[PDB]
Amino acid sequence: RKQKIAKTFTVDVSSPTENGVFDPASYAKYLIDHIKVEGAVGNLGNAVTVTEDGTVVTVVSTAKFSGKYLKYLTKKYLKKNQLRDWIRFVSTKTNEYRLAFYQVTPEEDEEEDEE
């Protein structure tokens, strides 16, 4: 009954924050006030803790916190800020994730030696 394992989850936000369309402080605050634990919001009584260093958002949990739930909450935040259709949430290796841009083709850029 002493299986109090402390799972860790890492999300890399560095590419959209460096390109200037994301905000990891607001993303972390969204996580603190929307993570559900035992069916209720704001019940984060030392069960999970999420921290933000400006490039990597880290969740450390000892409750029911699979990576599907983190993907679900991040997609909900991107929809709320209208960044769905532009940013996706992908897994690099196990429990390390990152925000990526969808594929975009460039413009023409051939008017009077513009490129």
Binding site: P106, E107, D109, E114, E115
Partner: protein, 50 residues
């Protein structure tokens, strides 16, 4: 986007010099057959007038 536009630039080749605005240099082949393919309808006639 300016970086990607600078990367996808142009470069032209001698094939685009000498073969741009050019058709194929081979015949029509009105039955649409290959080079070593038989044409039993038109083998015996060897000029287009006939």
């Amino acid at each position: 986007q300016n970086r990607a536009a600078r990367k996808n630039r142009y470069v032209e080749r001698g094939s685009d010099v000498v073969f741009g605005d050019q058709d194929a240099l081979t015949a029509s082949t009105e039955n649409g057959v290959k080079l070593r393919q038989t044409d039993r309808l038109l083998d015996g006639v060897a000029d287009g007038s006939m």
